[PDB]
Amino acid sequence: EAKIVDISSKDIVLREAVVEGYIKLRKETIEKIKNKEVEKGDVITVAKTAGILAAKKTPELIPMCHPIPLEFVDVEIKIEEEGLRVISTVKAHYKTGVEMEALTATSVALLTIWDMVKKYEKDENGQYPYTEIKSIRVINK
Amino acid sequence: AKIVDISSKDIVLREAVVEGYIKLRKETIEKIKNKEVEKGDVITVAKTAGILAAKKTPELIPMCHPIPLEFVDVEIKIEEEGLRVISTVKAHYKTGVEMEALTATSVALLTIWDMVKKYEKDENGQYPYTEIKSIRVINK
Amino acid sequence: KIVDISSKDIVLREAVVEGYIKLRKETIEKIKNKEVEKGDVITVAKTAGILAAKKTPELIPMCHPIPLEFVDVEIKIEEEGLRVISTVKAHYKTGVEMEALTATSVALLTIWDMVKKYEKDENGQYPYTEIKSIRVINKIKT
Amino acid sequence: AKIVDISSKDIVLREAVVEGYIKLRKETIEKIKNKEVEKGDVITVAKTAGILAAKKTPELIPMCHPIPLEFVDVEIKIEEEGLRVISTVKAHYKTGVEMEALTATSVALLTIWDMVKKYEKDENGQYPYTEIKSIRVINK
Amino acid sequence: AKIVDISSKDIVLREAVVEGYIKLRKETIEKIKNKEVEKGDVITVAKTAGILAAKKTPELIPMCHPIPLEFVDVEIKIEEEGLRVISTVKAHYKTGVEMEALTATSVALLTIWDMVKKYEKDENGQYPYTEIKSIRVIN
Amino acid sequence: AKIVDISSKDIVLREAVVEGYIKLRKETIEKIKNKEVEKGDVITVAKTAGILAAKKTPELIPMCHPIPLEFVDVEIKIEEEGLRVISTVKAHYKTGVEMEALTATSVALLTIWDMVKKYEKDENGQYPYTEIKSIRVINKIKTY
């Protein structure tokens, strides 16, 4: 069973969604990011860029998603003491909401953050005891 | 910004298991198991999205190396208040595959959300109970 | 080149394409009992076909990107093979036959990929497996 | 739903040849030969699309492995009642390449269809004669 | 990092024409004119790649908006010292298409380079002659 | 017509360095250095795009083989009248990496342009000054 629902009938209205996500990182890792000492690059900016691209890639990643003419995409990342918080904002005038884009942007930005600081988060067994992406959800539609 | 040189590294067994969880309403869950979801077979569609995602990891994550995957499995099991996704990836390369397992899980969870969007939204078009709880690398 | 649709009107575009893949009876039997190793053939194939519809412009050089409003891939099991019928809809300046054809083709390819080991003969060849005839069976007139 | 483990498979020469056919009106084949098709060089464009599609196979087919393709060729011949496409793909890896050759051919045929849509449609905008027939993996 | 809001902008006929050029050895030009390059029909393959590239712009340029293109054309002219590429894109949207026309031209130039790689390399495996130059929006 | 067979080729170290340049107006360059560009951090965004681009080469260039890249780095330096992009790609495979390096550089430059469009345009919406000047392979390992 599979299908992309018919939205021909629905009306073209302003669509907005704000999604929030959090990735738990080690205190030393946060310091490295803050002082921009991560060899792979500027963590925050790289993740934002990855998050913005992801928003546009949503339909090819999510099967039943409609291709949508996005009008605005913003990914904000705030550094906290226990990790990083990602907030993505998406908007367009279409006949089907944009939460999936906002949710995809956030998810990828969080993944990208993880990829950027892998060597600092892994322990002597090459594992992640502390690293964890927790609570990705929709703030408001 | 850069993809670090792995030239001087040995080709070894690379394996990774990731687990993720999405909180859903009980009514939504019941419909998922009774396969009464309008958009289709939720768990299978999500496994597929997750497996495809494992392969798209390098185009989604900037500093990730394009790698030769040998095995990819995404398992999803229904629980009383949500679905649990477990992704497993394996390869023989000079750089691990946890990003692939992490991406496969995130997209599978994203797909589960998409497939039940209308059953989870309240009368304000808001999602007060839905959320992707905890994606983490179980073992590498 | 990608033909200019600038001065074309925004209208309802819909197309239905059907295709067929010849499979062994034992394969057909595996698909029904949900005993195919790589997974649920029908659903995986439908999912791939739906995604392929959106991928059309990326695969076919002169195709325009299109705001698809509806995409459905139906897969019916027959004793000698699987039948795929894809339906695409959109209100735009250019029809959607190509999207329906691509969706169906990729669905058929996916079914094949899923049951490859049951279709192969002792020499590793495919003397019975065959994608027979993809066709546009109908589409709104423009 | 999963990408089967090929970790312990042998690394050996993998080759696949696929043949496909698209039935077209003669007035169409006429324009193809004369290269009077508005959208462009039908044959070369379809071949290019086919080569590209060979590489996009794993992105399109869920359970396919990303493989290091070493050779891809799409041959298209003009016949009186249609065009025949033959795609060949080679590699030295631990899993076959029939899917790559099947996809290259499938997309090469679709591109041909796209290029001559205008000429194949009948008075009611239907495609009563156009058809993609028999895509198969060839022996030897 | 952000895709600027364009919801309040006017929908209008958007067009963009980009010109680009690649210097090649005269011996390479000859092989293209005669259709004697191993990899294939340089002009048609580069044009096909450029057209596809126009559609991929939003996927390659981070802050680019996904735009419903209505027309894409890639002209490639053979000159005595190289090949000139001219791409034209058109749409009716809330934001221009210069980036689509620019991307089409660049990828077509890159494809040309790829097609004739072996013919351009000198004895040290270098490309002292080959060069993509002056990609710009004209008019 | 096709992607030539590289089977008989040897698996060796492949590396290329490409240099590219985009001409920008002085006021645009000032905003870049002051981080006053509305779209974001021009340098990092362009670098990230160039690196991703390196990986998409086979998808963009028809006769390119898919390659297991081992190193991709994009350098971007601000100059008086424009930005200089230098991409370095490396692999150990049967096909060099000049195309990956050229593509990374090209996309990085396109990204710079996209980022400062608003500052380059004139009152007509044209770009009389903006120009991607000269993308080229400045060096690459010799292969036999």
DSSP string, chain C: -B---TT---EEEEEEEEEEEE--HHHHHHHHTT--TT--HHHHHHHHHHHHHHHHHHHSTTPPP----EEEEEEEEETTEEEEEEEEEEEESS--HHHHHHHHHHHHHHHHHHTHHHH--TTS--SS-EEEEEEEEEE---
Q: Which residues of C touch D130 (CB under 8 A)?
A: 135-136
CB-CB contact of C93 with C40 (8 Å): no
Q: Is A76 exposed, middle or buried (0-12, 13-18, 19+ CB in 10 A)?
A: middle
What is the rounded (10 degree) CA torsion for D62, D66, D67, D69? Answer: 90
Percent composition of chain B: helix, strand, coil (DSSP 3-state, to 5): 35, 35, 30
Burial E103-129 (b: 16+ CB within 10 A, else e): bbbbbbbbbbbbbbbebbbeeebbbeb
Annotated catalytic residue, options F5, F73, F114, F122: F114
CB-CB contact of A3 with C72 (8 Å): yes
CB-CB contact of F17 with F87 (8 Å): yes
Rg (CA), chain F: 17
Q: What is the 3-state secondary structure (H, E, C) of A10-58?
A: CCCEEEEEEEEEEEECCHHHHHHHHCCCCCCCCHHHHHHHHHHHHHHHH
Angstrom distances, CA of residue F141 to CA of A63, C23, C24, D9, F138: 43, 50, 52, 33, 11
Q: Is the dihedral of CA A74, E68, B50, B89 positive or negative?
A: negative
Among chain F residues, CA nearest to A52: F45
CB-CB contact of C105 with C19 (8 Å): yes
Q: DSSP states of F96-131 as a string? A: --HHHHHHHHHHHHHHHHHHHHHHH--TTS--SS-E
Q: Where are the beta strands (DSSP E) in chain E?
A: 2-3, 12-23, 71-79, 82-93, 131-137
* Residue count of chain D: 140
Q: Is D12 exposed, middle or buried (0-12, 13-18, 19+ CB in 10 A)?
A: exposed
Q: Which residues of D touch C142 (CB under 8 A)?
A: 125
Query: In angstroms, rounded to a whole number, what is the distance separating the alpha carbons of residues B72 and D65?
Result: 9
Angstrom distances, CA of residue C130 to CA of B23, C31, C103: 44, 17, 17
Residue type, F106: S
Query: In angstroms, rounded to a whole number, what is the distance separating the alpha carbons of residues D44 and D26?
Result: 20
Q: Which residues of C touch D107 (CB under 8 A)?
A: 59-60, 105
CB-CB contact of E130 with F137 (8 Å): yes
Given an 8 Å threshold on Cβ–Cβ distance, is A92 in contact with E59? no
Six-digit token pair at D88? 């060949």
Optimal mutation site among F61, F95, F143, interface E, most CBs of chain E within 10 A: F61
CATH class of F1-144: alpha beta
Q: Does the A1-141 domain belong in CATH 3.30.70.640?
A: yes
Give the relative orientation of helices A43-61 and C41-59 as an angle to the nearest 10 degrees: 110
Among chain F residues, CA nearest to A112: F48
Task: Out of 3.40.50.300, 3.30.70.640, 3.50.50.60, 3.40.50.12140, select the CATH number for domain B1-140.
Answer: 3.30.70.640
Closest of B87, B10, B86, B13 to residue B55, by C-alpha: B87
Six-digit token pair at D85? 């496409």
Query: In angstroms, rounded to a whole number, what is the distance separating the alpha carbons of residues C23 and C39?
Result: 17
Angstrom distances, CA of residue F13 to CA of B58, D57, F142: 22, 28, 9
Q: CA of D95 to nearest chain B CA: how many angstroms apart? A: 9
Six-digit token pair at E118? 């072996």
Among chain C residues, CA nearest to D101: C109
CATH placement of domain E1-139:
3.30.70.640
CB contact set of C125 (below 8 Å; sequence gap of 6+): D137, D139
Query: In angstroms, rounded to a whole number, what is the distance separating the alpha carbons of residues D46 and D36?
Result: 15
Optimal mutation site among A16, A46, A53, A61, interface E, most CBs of chain E within 10 A: A53
Residue type, F67: I
Q: Is A122 left (phi over 0), alpha (psi -120 to 50) or beta?
A: beta
How many Cβ atoms are within 10 Å of C25's Cβ, its own excluded?
11
Residue type, D58: P
Closest of C113, C95, C97, C82 to residue C19, by C-alpha: C82
Closest of B41, B45, B43, B36 to residue B82, by C-alpha: B43
Q: Where are the domains of chain B?
A: 1-140
Residue type, E26: K
Rg (CA), chain D: 17
Closest of D45, E50, C58 to residue F106, by C-alpha: E50
Nearest to B74 among D1, D65, D66 (CB): D1
Closest of F47, D110, A21, C101 to residue B132, by C-alpha: A21
Per the entry, the structure determination technique was: X-ray
Six-digit token pair at A57? 């890639």
Query: In angstroms, rounded to a whole number, what is the distance separating the alpha carbons of residues E74 and D39?
Result: 12
Given an 8 Å threshold on Cβ–Cβ distance, is C1 in contact with D132? no
CB-CB contact of C135 with C18 (8 Å): yes
Given an 8 Å threshold on Cβ–Cβ distance, is B62 in contact with F56? no
Six-digit token pair at F144? 């036999």
Query: In angstroms, rounded to a whole number, what is the distance separating the alpha carbons of residues D114 and C101?
Result: 10
Among chain E residues, CA nearest to A67: E66
Six-digit token pair at D38? 């508005």
Given an 8 Å threshold on Cβ–Cβ distance, is A45 in contact with F41? yes
Three-state DSSP at B40 gives strand
Q: What angle do CA B9, B11, B15 make, to 5 degrees?
A: 115
Query: In angstroms, rounded to a whole number, what is the distance separating the alpha carbons of residues E61 and E64?
Result: 6
Nearest to A1 among C12, C43, C53 (CB): C43
Given an 8 Å threshold on Cβ–Cβ distance, is C70 in contact with A2? no
Six-digit token pair at B85? 């996704």
CB-CB contact of C111 with D94 (8 Å): no
Query: In angstroms, rounded to a whole number, what is the distance separating the alpha carbons of residues A107 and E22?
Result: 41
Q: Which residues of F touch D70 (CB under 8 A)?
A: 5-7, 65, 94
Phi, psi angle pair for B45, to nearest 5°: -60, -40
* Residue count of chain A: 141
Find the farthest-apart pair of alpha carbons in chain B and give their distance in angstroms, rounded.
Answer: 57
Q: CA of D15 to nearest chain B CA: how many angstroms apart? A: 19
Q: CA of A141 to nearest chain F CA: how many angstroms apart? A: 24
Q: What is the 3-state secondary structure (H, E, C) of E88-117?
A: EEEEEECCCCHHHHHHHHHHHHHHHHHHCH
Architecture category of domain C1-142 in CATH: 2-Layer Sandwich (3.30)
F5 carries an active-site annotation:
no
* Beta-strand pair D2-3/E2-3: unpaired
Six-digit token pair at B86? 């477990």
Query: In angstroms, rounded to a whole number, what is the distance separating the alpha carbons of residues B52 and D59?
Result: 7
Element (H or E) spanning F23, and its range? strand F12-23
